[PDB]
Amino acid sequence: DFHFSAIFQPTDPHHHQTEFAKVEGSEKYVEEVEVFGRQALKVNPEALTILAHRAFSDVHHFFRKDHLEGWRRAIEDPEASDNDRYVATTLLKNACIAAGRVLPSCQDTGTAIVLGKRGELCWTGGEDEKYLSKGIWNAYRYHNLRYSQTAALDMFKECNTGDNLPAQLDLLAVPGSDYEFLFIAKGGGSANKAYLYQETKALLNPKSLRAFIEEKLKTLGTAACPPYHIALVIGGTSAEMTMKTVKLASCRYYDSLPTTGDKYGRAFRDPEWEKIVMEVAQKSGIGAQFGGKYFAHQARVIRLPRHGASCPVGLAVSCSADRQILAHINKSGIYIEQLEQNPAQYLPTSVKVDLKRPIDKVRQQLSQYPVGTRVMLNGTLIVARDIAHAKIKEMMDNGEPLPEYMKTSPIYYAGPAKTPEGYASGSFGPTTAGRMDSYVDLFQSHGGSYITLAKGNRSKQVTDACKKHGGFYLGSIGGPAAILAKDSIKQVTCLAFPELGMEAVWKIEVEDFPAFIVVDDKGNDMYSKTLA
Amino acid sequence: DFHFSAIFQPTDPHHHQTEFAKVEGSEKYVEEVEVFGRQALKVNPEALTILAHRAFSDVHHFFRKDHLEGWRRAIEDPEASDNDRYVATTLLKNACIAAGRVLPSCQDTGTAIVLGKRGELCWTGGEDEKYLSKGIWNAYRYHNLRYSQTAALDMFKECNTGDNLPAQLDLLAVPGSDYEFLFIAKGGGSANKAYLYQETKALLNPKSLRAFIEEKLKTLGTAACPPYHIALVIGGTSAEMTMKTVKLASCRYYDSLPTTGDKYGRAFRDPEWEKIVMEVAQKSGIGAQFGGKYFAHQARVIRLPRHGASCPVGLAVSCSADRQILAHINKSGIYIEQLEQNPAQYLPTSVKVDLKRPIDKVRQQLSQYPVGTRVMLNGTLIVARDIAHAKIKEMMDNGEPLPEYMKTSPIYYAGPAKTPEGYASGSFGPTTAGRMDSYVDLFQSHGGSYITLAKGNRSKQVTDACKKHGGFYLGSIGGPAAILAKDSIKQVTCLAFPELGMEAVWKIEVEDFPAFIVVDDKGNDMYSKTLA
Ligand code: SF4
Ligand code: SF4
């Protein structure tokens, strides 16, 4: 006989476990009505604008308890490494500055993603995408955020959209008369650490699955600012369904799923394998960015049904900029998830490097120290990331020289958020180093980029280049963009390619800028043991 | 200054270019009403059951014109290889059998996927997933299809759901009062050939993108029954959005997108790079499964916006079992895409191998011929695929011998659809060989699986195993499950593991079963040059 079984059967489908605050007076935007014997809700679409604006504003200044608890856990655990505690302390202090509501917690204020669930009898007028986008436009336009969306004018010619649009708007049709939401301000770095694997039945035994987890977790590296929320999805009805599921799992959206399967193929959370993932993460030694125990905050493992011929697998993280907000509109008005507004309650030996000298003198000083040495940088950084590197390579391919500004100073891979009025800099932390790896040997061979500054482990070609050319790669802490802006960055100037927005070349003056020597000029790599 | 721009702006959003048929009398399921000044449509949810039942029945017996035209092109093109023409003729003859409405075109009748777009004022009662699932249940229960879904009772313990449920039900909230659908009966083999790559700005130039396409197309190999509809998506707002987009592109759902980008980041189809994909596919020499020009029917390339730090890329195919159906419900009733009911209008030596001999004598005969030799098999095949291979390896890990029935006959990797009344067998084509690669050396070392029969290129370990043990891998044509059942398969009996259903070990008798020698007993592989 026919028996319908929904794949996802959360015991808390409306997220009653979350605390919400009502937007004051927002009941003026809704009206409960009764049509053809059923309860319906008229919603002024302006409510969607109000809600998206507040959500994509608040989420940049506050965090969830389970995120903050993880940093405090990394500080208080006796088994944490010194680097574990240093990174976690820095990120918590960063969260305290972001809670001042001026600087966002990360310079990468993310892609705006909306998961919406509009009830059959929730009536908005139907222009939901436009009104949601206007609220997002408002949040990024009128706050000290960043325009991160790159439009393709043709296959290769690109420009910044200048407003952080378009958003990803996934609006679903569901029963009832309410409107439920998950808003995600998704950073590019953690979005890049969402992986799809095509596997087989040969994986589905304890030994093979454990080895698989050990292998794949290492490929995450430190490039998305751990401690991670690690999500793992085994199975799925299609690649895109698996990847949607691992995204939502990383947002703890499926925490209330059943924990056992059944003959109808329902999804379930697997706490036993979450514990195994956490054991792999801890024993890896990768740590909170620079070696230790706190590679991961927590783990979510969801087992899904599969076509007999198929076994898609998804792996994804939520990064230090852990930014999602639940919300709903009902007959009483607009409700938005309450984040922690007082992160301070969760709070329970370096080499001074003067950059104000010839770059060869800085290289000689750095050459005296092993990888893993904590440094503090004082002086000028030249800022350049993906597009500027591509333009400079193209210039050199046409016979033009490597520009002078790639030869005078360490290269900081970064793109700033907008500068608050009266501030020296907006949030201005690093971007992922690995994306620039293909340029390092080329640029060093042409007399520049000897010292680079960013975050994440890099490929072997960069280790070889630094040894061949006497270069260095310095790893900044990943994520603490607001405290770096408040305490370290003293002057910001646009140097070249202003049309690229945040991806322009910048010249900045910094003081007390912390970093680790990750790659030296001798073939050493402080990630060589944990990530290889 | 705010301008809303939807990412996807098809010029034919309601698919007017597609021909639809009305379900007779279906206007009885809908009623136009007016509520708060707005036009709404009441839809009896039984309409969803009727529509899903007809869609997931019809799609297994008929094809779209552009699919059939591609097979005809492979026969009539002077540049098609002889093997191109042979394969395309076989697939067209298979489609003629399937159009008889008894045998489905492929034994893998797929995962049932519904993309639904319910208007704000389309009122179904809200139980859409149950009623859609009942229609899907009806189609797979009451027709000669296959139950292909595998439930996870725990992480590793699995069972078949016995009804091809659960479906993938992606129901979206959209403007208006209609209900629009794309139904996809997605085979597992092509679902497995959906890949996500995390790339960078360094890819976004003509030389790098061309080399990337050349590299990735080869990794598709022949294991998903080409000629392929190849879809490539560059960019996207998230991994899951990229993979959803490449899925829909492969179904030609986005054919009416604009062909230029703009400063707002709208998606566009790129005809120039579609031509380049087709040039790469044709010049690859991979061909329609066995060498030649017709690796691909056609190509779709969508360029998407991206976060500056991100460049997700999706690559996916639609296989020979190209199965999708558009539909909509409106004030006039239920409309469903009209597929081609007369595929015959598109229609314009070998070595006899007796399998009824000692397996060692069959090995000696096969040893006389080079790879690429076409053979015609007559006799017994022992049928076993993923689950049976895993269970047999598990038995051996527990000290049990390889069963005798794995040593007497060639091993056919396949799983049959249900047997029509009065037929010797239901549709019964091959399964992808690569998924069994990890078993071959082990099984041959214990005296069995010397000759295997399936589809697709295999890994080096199988070539090395066949050379070490005097084995062979034979490639059946991929896809022609109905004509194989009708013409070649004369008897089917369950031999072992009846509890596994479709994945039990079968003993079948075949006549005039065509295959190519893909791997011989000498280290040769007919794909070594095209898939190097
Ligand atoms: S915390 Fe790190 S990975 Fe996350 S958005 Fe910010 S820079 Fe990117
Ligand atoms: S056997 Fe071939 S045609 Fe059939 S679903 Fe699998 S890949 Fe597609």
Curated annotation (Swiss-Prot), chains A, B:
GO terms for molecular function: 4 iron, 4 sulfur cluster binding; fumarate hydratase activity; metal ion binding; protein homodimerization activity. Optimum pH is 9. It is found in: Cytoplasm, Cytosol. Its cofactor is [4Fe-4S] cluster. It catalyses: (S)-malate = fumarate + H2O. GO terms for cellular component: ciliary plasm; cytoplasm; cytosol; glycosome. Gene3D superfamilies: Fe-S hydro-lyase, tartrate dehydratase beta-type, catalytic domain. Pfam families: Fumerase, Fumerase_C. (S)-malate 2 binds at N192, K193, A194, Y195, L196, Y197, Q198. InterPro entries: Class-I_Fumarase/Tartrate_DH, Fe-S_hydro-lyase_TtdA-typ_cat, Fe-S_hydro-lyase_TtdB-typ_cat, Fe-S_hydroAse_TtdB_cat_sf, Fe_dep_fumarate_hydratase. Binds 1 [4Fe-4S] cluster per subunit. Keywords: 4Fe-4S, Cytoplasm, Iron, Iron-sulfur, Lyase, Metal-binding. Its main location: cytoplasm. Specifically and competitively inhibited by 2-thiomalate, which coordinates with the catalytic [4Fe-4S] cluster. Weakly inhibited by malonate. One of its GO terms (biological process) is fumarate metabolic process. Belongs to the class-I fumarase family. Cytosolic fumarate hydratase that catalyzes the reversible hydration of fumarate to (S)-malate. Homodimer. This is Fumarate hydratase 2. It comes from Leishmania major. The gene is FH2.
